[PDB]
């Protein structure tokens, strides 16, 4: 769904949602893979999308 | 004594009707995002 998901972050970003991906996120991602992983996690707040 | 009481018959009187509320996204679009770097030898 790589080729798919860039297309629906676009979309979601114009409709100004911060949609946090690890393409997108590299810089910060690459510190430590597992905890960026756990900040999204962790928090209630942030909606999770599965790309079935 | 056929005068005691009457059958009487029940409506609600004050109906009321109105229309359902649909929400809709106004426009749509999508601008491209940014990717590359060259290689080199």
Redesign the interface.
Request: avoid cysteine.
């Given at each position: 769904t790589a080729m798919e998901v860039?297309?629906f972050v676009?979309?979601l970003l114009?409709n100004g949602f911060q949609t946090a991906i690890d393409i997108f996120e590299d810089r910060i991602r690459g510190i430590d893979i597992i905890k960026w992983m756990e900040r999204y996690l962790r928090d209630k707040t942030v909606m999770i999308i599965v790309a079935i | 004594a056929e005068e005691g009481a009457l059958v009487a018959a029940v409506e609600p009187g004050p109906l009321a009707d109105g229309a359902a509320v649909r929400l809709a996204l106004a426009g749509e679009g999508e601008a491209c995002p940014l990717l590359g770097s060259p290689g080199a030898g």
């Open positions: 860039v297309k676009n979309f114009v | -």
